[PDB]
Amino acid sequence: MKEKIRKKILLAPEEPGVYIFKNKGVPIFIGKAKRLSNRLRSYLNPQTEKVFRIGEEADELETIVVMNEREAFILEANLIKKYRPKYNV
């Protein structure tokens, strides 16, 4: 994983949000979190091959802090629909 992505993961707040792993400007995986800190840190110790791939292929990680879990829900759904990232099913 790129050092800047690791750094961004470790600095992420304990707040609800949506995250977007990207490569060459293109979203490759979108997810949401009740706590960005907790969810993103899971990427450092991959429990699945897919999680490994996402963190290795990404050259950028964007995070969007949101008001609450209801917002995370709809923002995530909307962004997935818009971008249809590689790793989202």
Cα separation, 53 vs 57, whole angstroms: 6
Q: Is 55 in the site for Mn ion (CB under 5 A)?
A: no
Of all residues in the shown chain, the one whose CB is closest to Mn ion is 68
Cα separation, 26 vs 34, whole angstroms: 24
Cα separation, 85 vs 41, whole angstroms: 21
Q: Where are the alpha helices (DSSP H) in 14-61?
A: 36-41, 49-57
Question: x/- string (CB under 5 A) for Mn ion, residues 31-50?
Answer: x-------------------
Stretch that binds Mn ion, among 1-9, 12-20, 44-52, 61-69 (CB under 5 A): 61-69
Stretch that binds Mn ion, among 11-19, 24-32, 34-42, 51-59 (CB under 5 A): 24-32
Q: Which two tokens stand for residue 17?
A: 């949000």
> Given the rule CB under 5 A, which residues bind Mn ion?
31, 68, 70
